Structure 1
Amino acid sequence: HRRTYVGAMPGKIIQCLKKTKTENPLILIDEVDKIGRGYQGDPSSALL
């Protein structure tokens, strides 16, 4: 989130960088087939 939004924290991936401590981990996106492709801002566009 913007960090000016109330309650903002960086997206999940950043938590993985803080936790996993490498610059080159092995992210495993799961179940791409069921990604929410809605009118409300398609995350699947955001993933590209």
Structure 2
Amino acid sequence: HRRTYVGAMPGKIIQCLKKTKTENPLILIDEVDKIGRGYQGDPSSALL
């Protein structure tokens, strides 16, 4: 989130980068096929 919203925390990716502590881990997106394409903001655009 923007960090001006109440309760904002960084996106999932930053947590994985924080966790693996290397710049080049092996991210594994799982189960891409059934991603939720709704009116509330389609993540599938975000993946591009």
Interval containing the TM-score (normalised by the shorter chain): over 0.9
**Deviation string, structure 1 residues 1-47 (Cα, Å, up to 9, x no partner):** 00111110100110001110010000000010110011111001111
Report SS of the residue matched to 2:9.
Answer: coil
Question: Which residue of the partner structure matches residue 27 of structure 1?
Answer: 27
Stretches of structure 2 lacking an aligned partner (at least 5 in a row):
none
Question: Which residue of the partner structure matches residue 36 of structure 1?
Answer: 36
TM-score by length of 2: 0.95
CA distance in 2, matches of 1:34, 1:26: 22
Stretches of structure 1 lacking an aligned partner (at least 5 in a row):
none
Identical aligned residues as a percent: 100
Runs of 4+ in 1 over 2 A off after TM superposition: none
